[PDB]
Paper text:
The replisome that replicates the eukaryotic genome consists of at least three engines: the Cdc45-MCM-GINS (CMG) helicase that separates duplex DNA at the replication fork and two DNA polymerases, one on each strand, that replicate the unwound DNA. Here, we determined a series of cryo-electron microscopy structures of a yeast replisome comprising CMG, leading-strand polymerase Polε and three accessory factors on a forked DNA. In these structures, Polε engages or disengages with the motor domains of the CMG by occupying two alternative positions, which closely correlate with the rotational movement of the single-stranded DNA around the MCM pore.
To test this hypothesis, we performed a rigorous 3D classification focused on the C tier of the MCM ring of all replisome particles. This analysis identified six conformational states of the replisome, referred to as States I-VI, which vary in both Polε stability (Conformers I-IV) and the location of leading-strand DNA lining the MCM pore. In State IV (1.2% of the total particles, 7.29 Å), the leading strand DNA is completely released from Mcm2 and translocated onto Mcm4 to engage with Mcm5/3/7/4 subunits. Therefore, in Conformer IV, Dpb2-NTD becomes the only part connecting Polε to CMG. Notably, minor conformational changes in the Polε binding sites can also be observed from Conformer II (State III) to Conformer III (State IV), gradually leading to a floppy Polε.
Author numbering:
A (entry chain C): 1 to 58, 68 to 144, 158 to 194
B (entry chain 2): 773 to 800, 804 to 868
C (entry chain A): 1 to 107, 119 to 208
D (entry chain 5): 20 to 107, 131 to 198, 205 to 213, 235 to 305, 320 to 338, 348 to 415, 421 to 443, 446 to 451, ...
E (entry chain B): 1 to 38, 47 to 201
F (entry chain 3): 18 to 56, 90 to 331, 338 to 449, 454 to 497, 503 to 583, 648
G (entry chain 2): 580 to 583, 588 to 609, 614 to 629, 640 to 676
H (entry chain D): 75 to 107, 120 to 294
The structure:
DNA sequence: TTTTTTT
């Protein structure tokens, strides 16, 4: 999550729904209307880097973020059913980082517990896949397609470590 | 038992003749497929002579056969002009 | 938006980082994203002009306390995001260049920018200078692999011809094997002339 | 016997535990990996086991059908030992094997070949749907209400008549819930045409597969099967039997970029002369016809597809019409990621069943002789190629190419018609046969990659240029008809041209190129 | 950068082998490097030279494992097999692991690497057949792997204890376990007010 | 048995944990009593969240998934006991007491691996609860079952009853019941079957083809039959997507029996659906806040203008046609007189314009704007087909395109290209609002028509009817006739070019510039 | 094609292989010939083509070019 | 975190390496003029291994210096920092850090800071939401093996204390959870580097 | 078997 971290930059660039708590003339560029003043109660998705700051500051905060479908209770129920079967990458490549940022902006113990359980199950599956080494598979391909980009990087690191260890063991 | 082999010098003359035949078809068609058919008919004439190497006369008679095919196509329309233009081209020898 | 170009540049940086992590051997780095960088710089110049206009509006005094403050804050945040993206991409490319200099220059100029090429030359000069002086006894450019094998059979991957040794000249005639200490043949292996006996 | 069978299972387990490919036991490691992937099965190479342990292979060849279940039981025992901690059963593990021996022709297979392992090759005519085989059962005796379990191996048993706690004639009745089942697929494999004697149709044989062996292949695929020739009697000559081959293993003859792989596409996009290079590589033997090559490239790229919020959708494919074009169409069929080359015969229609136009999706679809063919008349083709749709409707979202020698021309995005040194060079190449440059596959992959990666839109300058040119053309025509359909065709051509460079937006240069190409219409 | 990306988190198996080589090992010399009262010298700056210079034929002596293997490359050196590297000791460790699924057998942290290196080179010195020792090592590795799987099932963000686990096993598990525990700790911290 | 009793107690504990489930069972009972008094009776079927059963006991939910036969029957028995206790059951009929309707149980949401498709269905899923989704196909016609063959021995005064069980109907395997009415009573008096007292529940078993998009290329989609009973029967029809929470069940000998010599056949597998859910993939939903907003919109000075401007906002120059389309979407009022005369509740509009005038684009936008719409193209549209359709099947009648969505509007491209005979068949729809073949199909649908001039370019000198291919009688049959055609003006051309450029410049929220999509 | 079960029978052009095949009345047979000439496949004909076609189904007339006398392809005439 | 540079130990090792190389060269001259080169090969391999270890440690130190160049400039500017930059680094390390930071600052300034407004032109400023200065993660988890007390006597170490089953242990606390735990002597554990740093400075535990 | 009608 570094300042120069490209993945963190992309996750911050991701937009989230929000509802305006203020009416600001001259902010029509965010509205995408050249001369229309911003209005209170207006609903507009905003980039996470800007939406989070607007939710933090404003006293009444300047904007209030609406709950995303990635944070929807239906997605939560699907995760509680089967953490592995869900396509977290299709939902968001930075879904875990976005969940962590949403927990930081709004402390949610149950959400953190559900996210941790999903991460643990997906990590067990990813560890099984990484332990499976060549002496592309459809099952691993579908699992990676479900797996987010960060989880795929972790899986690549673990699988490369296992493959290097096996190669060094089987070769002089 | 015999596999005809195209002669290189006769084939050079036949390639010049094939360019001339395409030009004559434009004048009054002829195709690289027809030139390949000339090579095959030269193989056929070598077979008729039972020669493993295609004769220059075999290639010439094959060019004559392909020219006869071109003349037969649109016979009344182009046959006289084709014969006049191909009196030298139909047979290399 | 203005930050979208920086996001695209950072996406290219992440793609190149994943590629370099995938390939152990150093590939020729992707050509510098001069187009996206120049677009981001033009956006930064436009935002600077907008901030100057906002300061002029504040001198006019209309809503300078709140509306102009928010507009200037938004423009400054956009400039900061663009600068962060550009710095991240440049740092990743420069780290790749430093790794390449450690790999080869210690023992694809079109892809690099001219400033990047000057920086890589300066890094190679710095490496040679660090080896040239104190701690010169150990070749800092020497391989980081532990000395597992004192002696190893060596033969030419290529017919380079005569080659120097500590006290010998060895012909590298094609497919000519040898039996020598690994340390002396480490430089020749780095040259690639001899591979695995 | 039963002690000998237990000894055979124990010997299989011992060989698995004590066989090491290179001082590392592949059998133990492969079984553990299959357990990790939850693969309740194991694949064993006959070469590794029988390279020096010939006695096991001899016993297996003696009684393969009965021996295999003992090997599977040994696999289950070894898996339980390796994976389940003691003092802290598993589903049956299928055994997969490969003969790795000389194949036998399907016609050469005879009655003596039955009851023995056979290696062969052929093309599967079809693959039957899965059929669950009851691996286990619980059979309740009706008259005394008590149950007795039954397990079945799908090799080479029926419900016992007696009740055995005998109160009934056939009182035993299965408990479907307690019964455990395994899917099984039947396969019909035709012999390879070379294996068929000259002047004879290939012979076909019924074959069976179960568990992981099911769905391992697809119908129509040439494949090499490892299986024991067997016999069975269908319920439907005298003493005649129905031959079949229980499969031990299958090896198919038929059989997303890396860090280095994607960089090649990046370089191809980096080339500024990429469009002209593609046009030149298309029909290299043909001299001239630059407009034809450019139109082919633009059709392969296709216009950008978009859907308006109101539900209106822009056509996502360019259409080209021609009036040696057959060679160009043959090249286009290979270069296109998806293409169907035909003279309109299909007797299947071009638009229809599924036509060639419907089967082709995106890419380009080429017709060798569109005007010559009259089946699947142009009335259906007009709707298909204009609205990308056809009381039957079929998707027709694929670039249209027509070779030959109105309303269809109005639907078409473009129209067209159809050197001695070129003839000499082509003749020299053909004679050598008889006695920029980019690979076709690489160019097809690059075209698909550009279509998947970028769908360029018109920049404001390109839109203004297109509007001004369209107004000028309309004024000239009024002074002298061009339609907004042709204007949309030109816009699609501009988007297709920008797609090669993968630019975020099209350019006035693309607009000029599209207008120049349209001038040939 | 100076440090490879894979090396940023964990030591390579070759590095673990180098550490194991830095460990010492007993061997039987075949050269009377010791000179009678009636010559080149090691003069090692990182290790004892007196043992090497005092080695005599068939006089058991201990030296750093790398130097021991270097001498074993010559016929002069024959490495002494570790006592725990015996069939009876391996069977005892296996029985201990079986009786204690929770508790790993007290094998050395470099037991796996040392057994592999000895099988590569010191297979001749083993009085017990090398194949039986290899099978026992594989069985112990499988038991330890099952125990590691159970422990991963019983992971906790606060801490973990692995007493008798092999150093190679710890190095292999460092990336995955460290990343998972760090992610869990980050989730718990974000949950914390 | 004892485990079944423990599961019944645990499911009663689940109903106690979620008061809403017990309240819903009692609500079905109370609604049944009130509706029986008023006359419309709710079936004794209960659907609960799978996550709710998991919250009550994760072990119970996973156990129902693993052994639906062992758990779901006891859980439904517990639900039925709770419903019997909660229900007043006033004045129960003897036939109702004989019926003794069980309270069905269903699991909703969070299926995971239990969520399935017919191609992905497995033998392990057999004897296990699952949720399968796919396009319905080959649905069986509803056939009444028999809960019990209630009988009555003659002169005995006692009604002997014989229950019958089906393996597909019951998740647990059972020895087959005779399913034959007893000829004589156990007492020895002659036994007569008691119709009415005997209970018959409708049973339907519908195959469910895997979704064609989900079907692999070069392969036919798999189909798994799902058992349906009571309200679940006839819940969906072939060609309609549906998702059913049903336990896959191994069944039959599968070649294990002695009669099957080949033994090649596998064990029959038939899913037993606890519930059937039709799925759109539509129909708009109205809430109180949106209704207040709609009241404010009606309070607006130009409500019709606001709605029309909202309709096809991207389309340019067709705003008057969009106002006419809003009038057609309302359709007007439909009236059936005491005399039987019919006033149509639909309005037909026709607009003629040259190709690429976007009149057909506005018609497509109207088809999208309508919750239900019929699409046709005059070159490809037959009026006989629009009025009615014939299927070979005895032949089965099929509704015509105009008859389809008989209340909804029908948008037709190239209506002028459609033949005049087709237009006469359409006139049967336009004026009579009904079609007669000897089968008769109602055709009161609105007919919005996109057309082109017969010349292909509208001429001011030519009359609008002369330019239109439709006859004057057809134009009179149409409620409105328009002439919206492509034209070239300088300022309007700049505006339309800016509109197309604005459509291109519109950026999907998820896709940035240079990224493909998907007052 | 015929039932055997189902079995297939080889075509006549396929039956004539490597030996010169024969054609007459040069239009479905012409399509088999012409698809063969462009395709190199009739299934490959694998045989030379010899034509004995009456011109336009009647006595030959000198005025008609061969393409009119027998319907065919110009590429077929070239081949 | 970068460890403090041991100048005396590094210098003594370097002097020993120099003397060993000189002696090996003298032996080589004598051989070129008993005669057993096996001890010479042993000394050469020992020198190679020692030089490799020293170079690896120095390269890791330079990597840490470049990773926290901003934080090291901040620490050098910060008199309140307990450790002087020269104390933490070697002389060559300090010169390298200074020159590298200056070169990077010149490059970044000429690249972007000329166009950037002066208020935001500062490279190491904390005004950004993510501080541009990069510092070592104290709380990062790192494996460790309890070395036990540096002294032979377990009782002599106050940190060492009897735990259950007669096992010496060292009490430790994780500030985030405020959890206290005892680490048995001669045992391996995984803990945050911040809490581990106390025992590491005490040398009671060595990082794995 | 005999319309019916779609190919």
């Amino acid at each position: 999550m570094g300042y120069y971290d490209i993945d963190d930059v992309l996750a911050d660039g991701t937009e989230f729904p929000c509802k305006f708590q203020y009416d600001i003339p001259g902010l029509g560029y965010l509205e995408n209307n050249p001369g229309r003043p911003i209005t209170k109660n207006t609903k507009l998705s905003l980039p996470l880097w800007l939406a989070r700051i607007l939710a933090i500051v404003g006293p009444v905060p300047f904007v209030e973020l609406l709950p995303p479908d990635m944070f929807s209770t239906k997605v939560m129920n699907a995760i509680k059913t089967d953490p592995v079967a869900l396509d977290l990458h299709s939902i968001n490549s930075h879904f875990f980082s976005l969940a962590i940022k949403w927990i930081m902006l709004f402390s949610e113990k149950e959400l953190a517990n559900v996210v941790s359980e999903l991460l643990l199950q997906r990590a067990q599956e990813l560890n099984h896949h990484a332990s499976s080494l060549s002496i592309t598979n459809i099952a691993t391909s579908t699992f990676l397609l479900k797996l987010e980009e960060m989880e795929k990087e972790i899986y690549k690191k673990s699988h490369e470590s296992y493959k290097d260890t096996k190669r060094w063991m089987f070769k002089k | 038992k015999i596999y005809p082999k195209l002669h290189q010098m006769d084939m050079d003359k036949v390639s010049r003749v094939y360019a001339d035949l395409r030009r004559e078809s434009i004048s009054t068609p002829i195709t690289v497929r027809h030139l390949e058919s000339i090579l095959r008919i030269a193989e056929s004439f070598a077979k008729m002579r039972l020669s493993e190497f295609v004769s220059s006369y075999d290639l010439d008679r094959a060019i004559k056969v392909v020219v006869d095919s071109f003349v037969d196509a649109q016979k009344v329309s182009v046959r006289r002009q084709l014969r006049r233009s191909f009196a030298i081209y139909t047979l290399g020898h | 938006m203005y930050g979208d170009l920086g996001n695209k540049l950072v996406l290219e940086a992440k793609r190149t980082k994943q590629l370099y992590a995938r390939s152990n051997q150093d590939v020729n780095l992707p050509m510098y994203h001069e187009d996206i960088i120049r677009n981001i710089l033009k956006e930064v110049s436009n935002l600077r002009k907008n901030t100057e206009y906002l300061k002029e509006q504040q001198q006019l005094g209309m809503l300078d306390d709140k509306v102009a403050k928010c507009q200037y804050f938004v423009t400054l945040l956009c400039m900061e995001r663009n600068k962060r993206c550009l710095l991240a991409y440049q740092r990743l490319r420069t780290d790749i260049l430093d790794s390449m200099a450690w790999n080869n220059n210690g023992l694809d100029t079109n892809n690099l920018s001219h400033q990047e090429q000057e920086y890589l030359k300066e890094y190679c000069d710095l490496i040679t200078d660090l080896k040239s002086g104190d701690l010169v006894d150990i070749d800092l450019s020497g391989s980081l692999v532990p000395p597992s094998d004192v002696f190893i059979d060596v033969r030419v991957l290529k017919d380079a011809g005569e080659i120097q040794t500590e006290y010998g000249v060895f012909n590298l005639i094609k497919d000519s094997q040898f039996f020598v200490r690994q340390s002396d043949v480490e430089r020749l292996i780095q040259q690639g002339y001899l591979q695995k006996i | 016997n039963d002690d000998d069978n237990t000894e055979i299972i124990k010997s299989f387990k011992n060989f698995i535990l004590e066989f090491r490919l290179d001082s590392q036991f592949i059998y133990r490691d492969q079984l553990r990996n299959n357990i990790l992937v939850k693969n309740y099965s194991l694949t064993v190479n006959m070469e590794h086991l029988i390279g020096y342990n010939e006695d096991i292979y001899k016993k297996l060849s003696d009684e393969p059908s009965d021996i295999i279940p003992l090997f599977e039981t040994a696999i289950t025992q070894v898996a339980k030992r390796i994976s389940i901690l003691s003092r802290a059963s598993l589903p049956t593990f299928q055994l997969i094997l490969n003969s790795n021996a000389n194949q036998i022709p399907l016609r050469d297979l005879d009655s003596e070949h039955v009851s023995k392992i056979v290696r062969l090759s052929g093309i599967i005519i079809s693959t039957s749907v899965l059929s669950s085989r009851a691996t286990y059962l619980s059979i309740m005796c009706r008259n005394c209400r008590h149950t007795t379990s039954i397990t079945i191996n799908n090799f080479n048993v029926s419900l016992p008549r007696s009740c055995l706690s005998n109160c009934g004639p056939d009182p035993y009745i299965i408990i479907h819930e307690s019964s455990k089942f395994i899917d099984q697929q039947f396969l019909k494999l035709q012999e390879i045409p070379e294996l068929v004697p000259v002047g004879e149709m290939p012979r076909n044989l019924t074959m069976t597969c179960d568990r992981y062996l099911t769905n391992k292949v697809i119908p129509g695929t040439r494949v090499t099967i490892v299986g024991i020739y067997s016999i069975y009697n269908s319920k439907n000559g005298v003493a005649i039997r129905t031959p079949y081959i229980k499969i031990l293993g299958i090896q198919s003859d038929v059989e997303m970029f890396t860090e280095e792989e994607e960089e090649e596409f990046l370089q191809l996009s980096r080339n500024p002369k990429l469009y002209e290079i593609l046009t030149n590589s298309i029909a290299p033997s043909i001299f001239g016809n630059e407009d034809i090559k450019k139109a082919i490239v633009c059709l392969l790229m296709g216009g950008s597809k978009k859907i308006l919020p109101d539900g209106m959708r822009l056509r996502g494919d360019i259409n080209v019409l021609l009036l040696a074009k057959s060679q160009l169409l043959k090249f286009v069929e290979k270069v296109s990621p998806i293409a169907v080359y035909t003279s309109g015969k299909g007797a299947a229609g071009l638009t229809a069943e599924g036509g060639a136009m419907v089967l082709a999706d995106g890419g380009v679809v080429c017709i060798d002789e569109f005007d010559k063919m009259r089946d699947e008349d142009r009335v259906a083709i007009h709707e298909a190629m204009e609205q990308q749709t056809i009381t039957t409707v079929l998707n027709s979202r694929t670039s249209v190419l027509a070779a030959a020698n109105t309303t269809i021309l109005s639907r078409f995005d473009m129209i067209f018609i159809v050197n001695e040194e070129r003839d000499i060079s082509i003749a020299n190449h053909v004679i050598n046969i008889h006695t920029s440059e980019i690979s076709i596959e690489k160019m097809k992959r690059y075209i698909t990659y550009c279509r998947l990666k970028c769908a360029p839109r018109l920049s404001p300058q390109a839109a203004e240029k297109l509007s001004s040119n369209f107004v000028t053309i309309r004024k000239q025509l009024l002074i002298n008809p061009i339609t907004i359909r042709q204007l949309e065709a030109i816009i699609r051509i501009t988007e297709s041209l920008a797609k090669l460079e993968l630019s975020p937006i099209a350019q006035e240069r693309h607009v000029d190129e599209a207008i120049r190409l349209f001038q040939a219409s | 950068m100076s440090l490879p990306a894979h090396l940023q988190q964990t030591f390579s198996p070759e590095e673990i082998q180098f550490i194991v080589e830095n460990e010492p090992i007993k061997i039987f010399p075949r050269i009377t490097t010791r000179q009678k009262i009636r010559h080149t010298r090691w003069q090692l700056i990182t290790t004892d030279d007196k043992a090497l210079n005092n080695m005599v034929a068939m006089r058991s002596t201990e030296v750093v494992l790398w130097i021991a293997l270097l001498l074993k490359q010559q016929s002069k050196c024959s490495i002494v097999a570790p006592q725990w590297l015996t069939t009876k000791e391996l069977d005892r460790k296996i029985q201990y692991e079986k009786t204690h699924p929770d508790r790993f057998s007290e094998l050395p942290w470099n037991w796996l690497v040392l057994a592999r290196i000895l099988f590569n080179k010191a297979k001749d010195d083993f009085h017990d057949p090398i194949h039986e020792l290899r099978g026992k090592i594989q069985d112990l590795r499988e038991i330890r792997q099952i125990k590691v799987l159970k422990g991963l099932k019983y992971l906790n963000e606060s801490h973990l204890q692995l007493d008798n686990l092999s150093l190679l096993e710890i190095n292999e598990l460092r990336p995955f376990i460290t990343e998972i525990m760090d992610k869990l700790r980050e989730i718990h911290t974000a949950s914390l007010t | 048995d004892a485990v079944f009793g423990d599961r019944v107690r645990r499911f009663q504990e689940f109903l106690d944990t979620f008061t809403s489930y017990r309240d819903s069972v009692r609500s079905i009972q109370v609604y049944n009593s009130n509706n029986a008094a008023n006359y419309n009776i709710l079936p004794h079927r209960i659907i609960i969240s799978l996550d709710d059963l998991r919250e009550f006991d994760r072990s119970f939910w996973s156990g129902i998934l693993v052994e639906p036969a062992y758990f779901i029957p006891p859980a439904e028995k517990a639900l039925t006991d709770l419903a019997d206790s909660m229900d007043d059951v006033p004045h129960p009929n003897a036939s109702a007491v004989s019926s003794r309707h069980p309270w069905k149980l269903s699991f909703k949401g969070s299926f995971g691996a239990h969520a399935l498709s017919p191609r992905t269905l497995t033998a392990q899923h057999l004897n296990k609860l699952v949720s399968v989704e796919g396009i319905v196909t080959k649905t069986s016609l509803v056939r009444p079952k028999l809960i019990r063959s209630v009988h009555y021995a003659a002169k005995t005064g006692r009604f002997h009853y014989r229950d019958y069980t089906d393996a597909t109907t019951t998740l647990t395997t059972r020895i087959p019941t005779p399913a034959i009415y007893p000829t004589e009573d156990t007492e020895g008096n002659k036994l007569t079957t008691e119709y009415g007292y005997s209970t018959f529940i409708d049973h339907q078993r519908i195959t469910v083809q895997e979704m064609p998009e989900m079907a692999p290329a070069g392969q036919l989609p798999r189909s798994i039959d799902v058992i349906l009973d009571d309200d679940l029967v006839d819940k969906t029809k072939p060609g309609d997507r549906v998702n059913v929470v049903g336990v896959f069940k191994s069944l039959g000998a599968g070649g294990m029996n002695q009669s099957n010599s080949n033994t090649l056949i596998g064990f029959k597998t038939l899913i037993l659906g606890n519930t059937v859910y039709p799925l759109h993939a539509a129909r708009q939903m109205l809430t109180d806040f949106d209704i207040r907003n709609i009241n404010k919109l009606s309070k607006k000075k130009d409500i019709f203008d606001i709605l029309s401007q909202s309709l096809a906002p991207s389309i340019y120059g067709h705003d008057h046609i969009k106002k006419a389309i809003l009038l057609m979407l309302m359709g007007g009022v439909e009236k059936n007189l005491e005399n039987g005369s019919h006033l149509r509740g639909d309005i037909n509009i026709l607009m003629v314009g040259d190709p690429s005038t976007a009149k057909s684009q506005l018609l497509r936008f109207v088809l999208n704007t309508a919750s239900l719409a019929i699409a046709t193209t005059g070159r490809g549209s037959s009026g006989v087909g629009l009025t009615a359709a014939v299927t070979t099947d005895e032949r089965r009648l099929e509704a015509g395109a105009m008859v389809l969505a008989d209340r909804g509007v029908v948008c037709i491209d190239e209506f002028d290209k459609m033949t005049d005979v087709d237009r006469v068949a359409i006139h049967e729809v336009m004026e009579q609002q009904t079609v007669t073949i000897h089968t008769t199909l109602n055709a009161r649908c609105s007919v919005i028509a996109a057309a082109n001039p017969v010349f292909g370019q509208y001429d001011v000198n030519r009359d609008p009817h002369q330019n239109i291919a439709l006859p004057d009688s057809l134009l009179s049959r149409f409620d409105l006739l328009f002439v919206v055609t492509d034209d070239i003006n300088e300022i309007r051309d700049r505006s339309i070019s800016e509109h197309v450029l604005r459509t291109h410049r519109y950026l999907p929220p998820g896709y940035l510039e240079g990224e493909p999509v998907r007052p | 094609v015929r039932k055997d079960e189902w079995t297939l029978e080889g075509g006549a052009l396929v039956l004539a292989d490597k030996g010169v095949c024969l054609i007459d009345e040069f239009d479905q047979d012409r399509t088999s010939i012409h698809e063969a000439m462009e395709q190199q496949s009739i299934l490959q004909a694998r045989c030379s083509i010899i034509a004995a076609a009456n011109p336009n189904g009647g006595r030959y007339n000198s005025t008609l070019p061969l393409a009119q006398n027998v319907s065919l392809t110009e590429p077929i005439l070239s081949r | 975190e970068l460890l403090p540079y041991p100048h005396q130990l590094m210098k003594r090792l370097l002097n020993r390496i120099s003397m060993q190389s000189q002696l090996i060269e003298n032996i080589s001259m004598g051989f070129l003029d008993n005669e057993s080169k096996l001890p010479l090969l042993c000394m050469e391999t020992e020198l190679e291994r020692l030089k490799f270890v020293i170079r690896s440690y120095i390269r890791c130190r330079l990597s840490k210096i470049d990773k926290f160049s901003l934080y090291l400039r901040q620490l050098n500017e910060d008199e309140n920092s307990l450790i002087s930059l020269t104390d933490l680094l070697s002389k060559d390390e300090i010169k390298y850090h200074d020159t590298h930071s200056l070169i990077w600052l010149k490059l970044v300034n000429d690249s972007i800071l000329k166009y950037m407004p002066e208020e935001l032109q500062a490279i190491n400023d904390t005004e950004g939401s993510v501080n541009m200065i990069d510092e070592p993660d104290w709380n990062k988890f790192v494996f460790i093996h309890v070395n036990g007390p540096p002294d032979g006597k377990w009782n002599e170490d106050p940190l060492l204390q009897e735990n259950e089953f007669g096992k010496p242990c060292y009490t430790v606390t994780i500030p985030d959870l405020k959890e206290e735990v005892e680490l048995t002597i001669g045992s391996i554990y995984v803990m945050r580097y911040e809490v581990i740093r106390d025992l590491l400075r005490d040398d009671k535990v060595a990082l794995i």
